[PDB]
Design a protein around this ligand. Structure first.
Ligand code: B10
Length: 330
Protein backbone atom coordinates (compact mmCIF):
# COMPACT_ATOMS: atom_id res chain seq x y z
CA UNK A 1 0.00 0.00 0.00
CA UNK A 2 1.25 3.49 -0.92
CA UNK A 3 1.58 6.38 1.52
CA UNK A 4 -1.19 8.97 1.15
CA UNK A 5 -1.22 12.62 2.20
CA UNK A 6 -4.11 14.99 2.81
CA UNK A 7 -4.73 18.49 1.54
CA UNK A 8 -7.58 20.92 0.91
CA UNK A 9 -8.25 22.40 -2.53
CA UNK A 10 -11.02 25.00 -2.72
CA UNK A 11 -12.75 23.83 0.45
CA UNK A 12 -12.30 20.27 -0.88
CA UNK A 13 -10.33 17.55 0.93
CA UNK A 14 -7.99 15.43 -1.21
CA UNK A 15 -6.14 12.34 0.01
CA UNK A 16 -3.86 10.83 -2.65
CA UNK A 17 -0.62 8.77 -2.85
CA UNK A 18 2.61 10.80 -2.55
CA UNK A 19 3.27 9.63 -6.09
CA UNK A 20 0.99 12.41 -7.35
CA UNK A 21 2.40 15.83 -6.51
CA UNK A 22 1.56 19.51 -7.09
CA UNK A 23 -2.23 19.09 -7.25
CA UNK A 24 -3.99 21.89 -9.08
CA UNK A 25 -7.77 22.41 -9.47
CA UNK A 26 -9.05 22.36 -13.06
CA UNK A 27 -14.15 17.81 -8.96
CA UNK A 28 -10.97 17.29 -11.00
CA UNK A 29 -7.32 18.06 -10.27
CA UNK A 30 -4.27 18.25 -12.50
CA UNK A 31 -1.18 16.72 -10.92
CA UNK A 32 2.37 15.61 -11.55
CA UNK A 33 2.85 11.85 -11.51
CA UNK A 34 6.35 11.31 -10.10
CA UNK A 35 6.44 7.71 -11.35
CA UNK A 36 6.57 8.90 -14.97
CA UNK A 37 7.23 12.64 -14.98
CA UNK A 38 3.96 13.11 -16.87
CA UNK A 39 1.05 15.35 -15.90
CA UNK A 40 -2.20 13.54 -15.09
CA UNK A 41 -5.83 14.42 -14.35
CA UNK A 42 -7.26 13.17 -11.07
CA UNK A 43 -11.04 12.97 -10.78
CA UNK A 44 -12.56 12.53 -7.35
CA UNK A 45 -16.14 11.24 -7.41
CA UNK A 46 -18.59 13.43 -5.46
CA UNK A 47 -20.66 11.28 -3.09
CA UNK A 48 -20.31 7.93 -4.96
CA UNK A 49 -22.56 5.94 -2.63
CA UNK A 50 -24.92 8.59 -1.27
CA UNK A 51 -27.86 6.91 -3.05
CA UNK A 52 -28.45 3.73 -5.07
CA UNK A 53 -28.48 5.92 -8.17
CA UNK A 54 -25.06 7.38 -7.31
CA UNK A 55 -23.64 4.01 -6.30
CA UNK A 56 -24.62 2.36 -9.57
CA UNK A 57 -23.37 5.38 -11.52
CA UNK A 58 -20.06 5.13 -9.68
CA UNK A 59 -19.82 1.45 -10.54
CA UNK A 60 -20.90 2.16 -14.12
CA UNK A 61 -18.07 4.67 -14.64
CA UNK A 62 -15.37 2.53 -13.03
CA UNK A 63 -16.30 -0.52 -15.09
CA UNK A 64 -16.56 1.47 -18.31
CA UNK A 65 -13.33 3.34 -17.64
CA UNK A 66 -11.56 0.09 -16.70
CA UNK A 67 -12.54 -1.36 -20.05
CA UNK A 68 -11.68 1.59 -22.32
CA UNK A 69 -8.37 0.94 -24.09
CA UNK A 70 -8.24 3.05 -27.24
CA UNK A 71 -5.98 5.90 -28.38
CA UNK A 72 -8.96 8.18 -28.98
CA UNK A 73 -10.85 7.40 -25.75
CA UNK A 74 -10.04 8.39 -22.19
CA UNK A 75 -8.34 5.46 -20.46
CA UNK A 76 -7.77 4.63 -16.80
CA UNK A 77 -4.19 5.15 -15.67
CA UNK A 78 -4.92 4.51 -12.00
CA UNK A 79 -7.74 4.20 -9.48
CA UNK A 80 -7.40 4.38 -5.71
CA UNK A 81 -8.98 5.10 -2.35
CA UNK A 82 -7.43 6.03 1.01
CA UNK A 83 -9.65 3.43 2.70
CA UNK A 84 -7.76 0.40 3.99
CA UNK A 85 -10.91 -1.77 3.95
CA UNK A 86 -14.48 -2.09 2.65
CA UNK A 87 -15.69 -0.93 6.06
CA UNK A 88 -14.20 2.54 5.65
CA UNK A 89 -14.37 2.61 1.84
CA UNK A 90 -16.12 5.88 0.96
CA UNK A 91 -14.09 7.67 -1.74
CA UNK A 92 -12.99 6.88 -5.28
CA UNK A 93 -10.22 8.56 -7.23
CA UNK A 94 -9.68 7.96 -10.94
CA UNK A 95 -6.59 8.97 -12.95
CA UNK A 96 -5.96 9.64 -16.68
CA UNK A 97 -3.33 11.50 -18.76
CA UNK A 98 -3.65 15.28 -18.55
CA UNK A 99 -4.65 16.82 -21.89
CA UNK A 100 -3.77 20.23 -23.29
CA UNK A 101 -7.26 21.61 -23.90
CA UNK A 102 -10.81 21.10 -25.13
CA UNK A 103 -11.92 21.39 -28.73
CA UNK A 104 -13.64 24.52 -27.44
CA UNK A 105 -10.46 26.31 -26.38
CA UNK A 106 -9.01 25.50 -29.81
CA UNK A 107 -11.65 26.99 -32.12
CA UNK A 108 -11.75 30.33 -30.31
CA UNK A 109 -8.57 31.27 -32.20
CA UNK A 110 -9.24 30.84 -35.92
CA UNK A 111 -11.04 28.68 -38.48
CA UNK A 112 -9.12 25.43 -38.84
CA UNK A 113 -7.78 24.16 -42.14
CA UNK A 114 -9.83 21.51 -43.92
CA UNK A 115 -6.91 19.18 -43.29
CA UNK A 116 -7.10 19.98 -39.58
CA UNK A 117 -10.82 19.22 -39.58
CA UNK A 118 -10.27 15.92 -41.42
CA UNK A 119 -7.84 14.76 -38.75
CA UNK A 120 -9.89 15.84 -35.73
CA UNK A 121 -13.16 14.39 -37.02
CA UNK A 122 -11.35 11.25 -38.12
CA UNK A 123 -10.14 10.72 -34.55
CA UNK A 124 -13.60 11.31 -33.06
CA UNK A 125 -15.07 8.72 -35.40
CA UNK A 126 -12.23 6.30 -34.72
CA UNK A 127 -12.89 6.63 -31.01
CA UNK A 128 -16.66 6.46 -31.44
CA UNK A 129 -16.39 3.28 -33.54
CA UNK A 130 -14.58 1.73 -30.60
CA UNK A 131 -17.04 2.85 -27.93
CA UNK A 132 -19.98 1.80 -30.12
CA UNK A 133 -18.47 -1.65 -30.66
CA UNK A 134 -18.77 -2.14 -26.88
CA UNK A 135 -22.50 -1.46 -27.05
CA UNK A 136 -22.04 1.93 -25.47
CA UNK A 137 -23.59 5.24 -26.48
CA UNK A 138 -22.03 8.56 -25.48
CA UNK A 139 -25.17 10.72 -25.59
CA UNK A 140 -23.31 13.90 -24.75
CA UNK A 141 -20.78 14.44 -27.52
CA UNK A 142 -19.69 18.08 -27.77
CA UNK A 143 -16.51 20.21 -27.97
CA UNK A 144 -16.08 20.47 -24.20
CA UNK A 145 -15.91 16.64 -24.06
CA UNK A 146 -13.06 16.47 -26.57
CA UNK A 147 -9.45 16.65 -25.36
CA UNK A 148 -6.70 17.50 -27.86
CA UNK A 149 -2.92 17.74 -27.37
CA UNK A 150 -0.05 19.72 -28.92
CA UNK A 151 0.07 17.06 -31.62
CA UNK A 152 -3.61 17.54 -32.51
CA UNK A 153 -4.33 14.07 -31.14
CA UNK A 154 -7.84 13.68 -29.78
CA UNK A 155 -9.45 11.78 -26.89
CA UNK A 156 -13.16 11.47 -26.09
CA UNK A 157 -14.36 11.77 -22.51
CA UNK A 158 -17.41 12.67 -20.43
CA UNK A 159 -17.54 15.31 -17.68
CA UNK A 160 -20.17 13.42 -15.68
CA UNK A 161 -20.17 23.75 -24.38
CA UNK A 162 -23.97 23.36 -24.78
CA UNK A 163 -25.01 19.68 -24.71
CA UNK A 164 -28.28 20.48 -26.51
CA UNK A 165 -26.67 22.32 -29.43
CA UNK A 166 -25.05 19.00 -30.42
CA UNK A 167 -28.01 16.93 -29.27
CA UNK A 168 -29.85 14.61 -31.65
CA UNK A 169 -33.51 15.61 -32.31
CA UNK A 170 -34.95 12.23 -31.32
CA UNK A 171 -33.47 12.79 -27.83
CA UNK A 172 -35.02 16.23 -27.35
CA UNK A 173 -38.36 14.84 -28.58
CA UNK A 174 -38.00 12.05 -26.03
CA UNK A 175 -38.55 9.23 -28.54
CA UNK A 176 -36.72 6.86 -26.14
CA UNK A 177 -35.25 4.10 -28.37
CA UNK A 178 -32.12 6.01 -29.29
CA UNK A 179 -29.64 4.32 -31.56
CA UNK A 180 -25.87 4.85 -31.61
CA UNK A 181 -25.97 7.34 -34.50
CA UNK A 182 -27.23 9.77 -31.90
CA UNK A 183 -23.48 10.40 -31.44
CA UNK A 184 -23.03 10.66 -35.22
CA UNK A 185 -25.46 13.57 -35.19
CA UNK A 186 -23.40 15.30 -32.54
CA UNK A 187 -20.24 14.71 -34.65
CA UNK A 188 -22.03 16.31 -37.58
CA UNK A 189 -22.78 19.43 -35.55
CA UNK A 190 -19.21 19.49 -34.29
CA UNK A 191 -17.67 19.15 -37.75
CA UNK A 192 -20.03 21.84 -39.08
CA UNK A 193 -18.81 24.21 -36.37
CA UNK A 194 -15.15 23.46 -37.14
CA UNK A 195 -15.67 24.24 -40.81
CA UNK A 196 -17.91 27.31 -40.58
CA UNK A 197 -16.62 28.77 -37.35
CA UNK A 198 -20.14 28.92 -35.91
CA UNK A 199 -22.59 26.77 -33.96
CA UNK A 200 -24.85 25.05 -36.50
CA UNK A 201 -27.97 24.99 -34.32
CA UNK A 202 -27.70 27.82 -31.70
CA UNK A 203 -31.09 27.43 -30.07
CA UNK A 204 -32.41 28.88 -26.82
CA UNK A 205 -34.80 26.28 -25.44
CA UNK A 206 -35.00 22.81 -27.01
CA UNK A 207 -38.16 23.89 -28.93
CA UNK A 208 -36.10 26.59 -30.64
CA UNK A 209 -33.40 23.94 -31.18
CA UNK A 210 -35.83 21.55 -32.87
CA UNK A 211 -37.18 24.34 -35.06
CA UNK A 212 -33.71 25.34 -36.23
CA UNK A 213 -32.91 21.68 -36.94
CA UNK A 214 -36.04 20.80 -38.93
CA UNK A 215 -35.74 23.95 -41.04
CA UNK A 216 -32.39 22.56 -42.16
CA UNK A 217 -32.81 18.77 -42.46
CA UNK A 218 -36.45 19.11 -43.49
CA UNK A 219 -39.92 18.03 -42.37
CA UNK A 220 -40.10 14.36 -41.33
CA UNK A 221 -40.76 12.21 -44.37
CA UNK A 222 -43.35 9.49 -44.88
CA UNK A 223 -40.78 6.75 -44.28
CA UNK A 224 -39.78 8.16 -40.87
CA UNK A 225 -43.32 9.16 -39.93
CA UNK A 226 -44.42 5.51 -40.01
CA UNK A 227 -42.02 4.51 -37.25
CA UNK A 228 -43.55 6.93 -34.73
CA UNK A 229 -46.12 5.11 -32.57
CA UNK A 230 -47.40 8.12 -30.64
CA UNK A 231 -49.86 10.27 -32.60
CA UNK A 232 -49.25 13.37 -30.51
CA UNK A 233 -45.53 12.91 -31.18
CA UNK A 234 -46.18 12.37 -34.87
CA UNK A 235 -48.14 15.66 -34.99
CA UNK A 236 -45.69 17.51 -32.77
CA UNK A 237 -42.67 16.99 -35.06
CA UNK A 238 -44.79 18.28 -37.96
CA UNK A 239 -45.84 21.39 -36.04
CA UNK A 240 -42.16 22.10 -35.37
CA UNK A 241 -41.31 21.94 -39.08
CA UNK A 242 -43.28 25.04 -40.10
CA UNK A 243 -40.36 27.41 -40.66
CA UNK A 244 -39.07 28.50 -44.13
CA UNK A 245 -36.81 25.60 -45.10
CA UNK A 246 -33.07 25.98 -45.77
CA UNK A 247 -30.55 23.91 -47.73
CA UNK A 248 -27.16 22.36 -46.95
CA UNK A 249 -25.03 23.60 -49.84
CA UNK A 250 -25.93 27.11 -48.69
CA UNK A 251 -24.97 26.67 -45.03
CA UNK A 252 -21.60 25.13 -45.93
CA UNK A 253 -20.65 27.08 -49.06
CA UNK A 254 -16.91 27.13 -49.63
CA UNK A 255 -16.20 23.92 -47.73
CA UNK A 256 -14.67 20.84 -49.35
CA UNK A 257 -17.47 19.12 -51.33
CA UNK A 258 -16.43 15.81 -49.73
CA UNK A 259 -16.94 17.48 -46.37
CA UNK A 260 -20.48 18.68 -47.13
CA UNK A 261 -21.31 15.26 -48.53
CA UNK A 262 -20.32 13.59 -45.25
CA UNK A 263 -22.30 16.18 -43.28
CA UNK A 264 -25.35 15.37 -45.33
CA UNK A 265 -24.81 11.77 -44.27
CA UNK A 266 -24.44 12.51 -40.55
CA UNK A 267 -27.11 15.21 -40.26
CA UNK A 268 -30.04 13.06 -41.26
CA UNK A 269 -33.30 13.35 -39.32
CA UNK A 270 -34.04 9.59 -39.46
CA UNK A 271 -31.44 7.96 -37.19
CA UNK A 272 -31.89 4.65 -38.99
CA UNK A 273 -30.46 6.32 -42.09
CA UNK A 274 -27.43 8.07 -40.54
CA UNK A 275 -24.00 6.81 -41.52
CA UNK A 276 -22.20 4.91 -38.74
CA UNK A 277 -18.74 5.59 -37.33
CA UNK A 278 -17.38 2.57 -39.20
CA UNK A 279 -18.92 3.58 -42.52
CA UNK A 280 -17.95 7.21 -42.00
CA UNK A 281 -14.29 6.31 -41.41
CA UNK A 282 -14.32 4.79 -44.93
CA UNK A 283 -15.71 7.98 -46.49
CA UNK A 284 -13.45 9.54 -49.15
CA UNK A 285 -13.25 12.67 -47.01
CA UNK A 286 -10.87 10.64 -44.84
CA UNK A 287 -8.94 8.86 -47.60
CA UNK A 288 -5.80 10.46 -46.18
CA UNK A 289 -6.05 8.88 -42.71
CA UNK A 290 -8.31 5.85 -43.11
CA UNK A 291 -6.60 2.52 -42.35
CA UNK A 292 -8.84 -0.58 -42.06
CA UNK A 293 -6.13 -2.28 -40.00
CA UNK A 294 -5.70 0.41 -37.35
CA UNK A 295 -9.31 1.21 -36.46
CA UNK A 296 -9.86 -1.31 -33.60
CA UNK A 297 -13.04 -2.46 -31.92
CA UNK A 298 -13.39 -3.40 -28.26
CA UNK A 299 -13.37 -6.69 -26.38
CA UNK A 300 -16.85 -7.89 -25.45
CA UNK A 301 -18.03 -5.63 -22.62
CA UNK A 302 -20.02 -7.14 -19.76
CA UNK A 303 -22.66 -4.67 -18.63
CA UNK A 304 -25.22 -7.18 -17.40
CA UNK A 305 -25.13 -5.09 -14.22
CA UNK A 306 -27.21 -2.42 -15.95
CA UNK A 307 -30.31 -4.59 -15.73
CA UNK A 308 -29.80 -5.01 -11.99
CA UNK A 309 -31.56 -3.47 -9.01
CA UNK A 310 -29.33 -3.84 -5.97
CA UNK A 311 -28.88 -2.25 -2.54
CA UNK A 312 -26.33 0.54 -2.08
CA UNK A 313 -24.04 -1.73 -0.09
CA UNK A 314 -24.06 -4.26 -2.92
CA UNK A 315 -23.07 -1.62 -5.47
CA UNK A 316 -20.45 -0.37 -3.02
CA UNK A 317 -18.90 -3.80 -2.57
CA UNK A 318 -18.84 -4.47 -6.33
CA UNK A 319 -17.19 -1.10 -6.84
CA UNK A 320 -14.67 -1.84 -4.08
CA UNK A 321 -13.82 -5.14 -5.82
CA UNK A 322 -13.07 -3.20 -9.01
CA UNK A 323 -10.79 -0.79 -7.19
CA UNK A 324 -8.58 -3.47 -5.65
CA UNK A 325 -8.64 -5.61 -8.79
CA UNK A 326 -7.16 -2.81 -10.88
CA UNK A 327 -3.91 -3.50 -12.66
CA UNK A 328 -2.28 -0.59 -14.51
CA UNK A 329 -1.33 -1.03 -18.17
CA UNK A 330 2.34 -1.13 -19.38
C1 B10 B 1 -19.09 10.12 -16.81
O1 B10 B 1 -18.51 8.81 -16.94
C2 B10 B 1 -18.10 8.49 -18.25
C3 B10 B 1 -16.72 8.64 -18.59
N1 B10 B 1 -15.89 9.11 -17.58
C4 B10 B 1 -15.15 10.24 -17.75
O2 B10 B 1 -15.18 10.86 -18.82
N2 B10 B 1 -14.41 10.66 -16.66
C5 B10 B 1 -13.47 11.70 -16.68
C6 B10 B 1 -13.74 12.91 -17.41
C7 B10 B 1 -12.84 13.98 -17.47
C8 B10 B 1 -11.58 13.94 -16.81
C9 B10 B 1 -10.73 15.17 -17.00
C10 B10 B 1 -11.09 16.44 -16.44
C11 B10 B 1 -10.27 17.59 -16.67
C12 B10 B 1 -9.11 17.41 -17.48
C13 B10 B 1 -8.19 18.58 -17.78
N3 B10 B 1 -8.81 19.52 -18.74
C14 B10 B 1 -8.48 19.04 -20.12
C15 B10 B 1 -8.89 20.09 -21.18
O3 B10 B 1 -8.29 21.36 -20.87
C16 B10 B 1 -8.70 21.87 -19.58
C17 B10 B 1 -8.26 20.88 -18.47
N4 B10 B 1 -8.80 16.18 -18.00
C18 B10 B 1 -9.55 15.08 -17.81
C19 B10 B 1 -11.21 12.75 -16.02
C20 B10 B 1 -9.95 12.62 -15.31
C21 B10 B 1 -9.66 11.43 -14.57
C22 B10 B 1 -10.60 10.34 -14.52
C23 B10 B 1 -11.85 10.43 -15.22
C24 B10 B 1 -12.19 11.60 -15.97
C25 B10 B 1 -16.28 8.31 -19.92
C26 B10 B 1 -17.23 7.83 -20.92
C27 B10 B 1 -16.78 7.48 -22.36
C28 B10 B 1 -15.68 6.39 -22.34
C29 B10 B 1 -17.93 6.95 -23.28
C30 B10 B 1 -16.24 8.77 -23.02
C31 B10 B 1 -18.61 7.70 -20.53
C32 B10 B 1 -19.04 8.02 -19.21
N5 B10 B 1 -20.35 7.88 -18.89
S1 B10 B 1 -20.89 6.66 -17.94
C33 B10 B 1 -19.67 5.41 -17.56
O4 B10 B 1 -21.24 7.32 -16.70
O5 B10 B 1 -21.94 6.05 -18.69
Amino acid sequence: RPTFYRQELNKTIWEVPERYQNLSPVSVCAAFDTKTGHRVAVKKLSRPFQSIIHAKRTYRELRLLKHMKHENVIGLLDVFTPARSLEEFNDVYLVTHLMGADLNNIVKCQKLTDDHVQFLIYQILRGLKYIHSADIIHRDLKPSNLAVNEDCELKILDFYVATRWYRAPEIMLNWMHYNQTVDIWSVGCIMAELLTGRTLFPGTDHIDQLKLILRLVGTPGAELLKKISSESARNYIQSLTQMPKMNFANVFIGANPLAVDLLEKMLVLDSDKRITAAQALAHAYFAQYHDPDDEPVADPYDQSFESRDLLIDEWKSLTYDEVISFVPPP
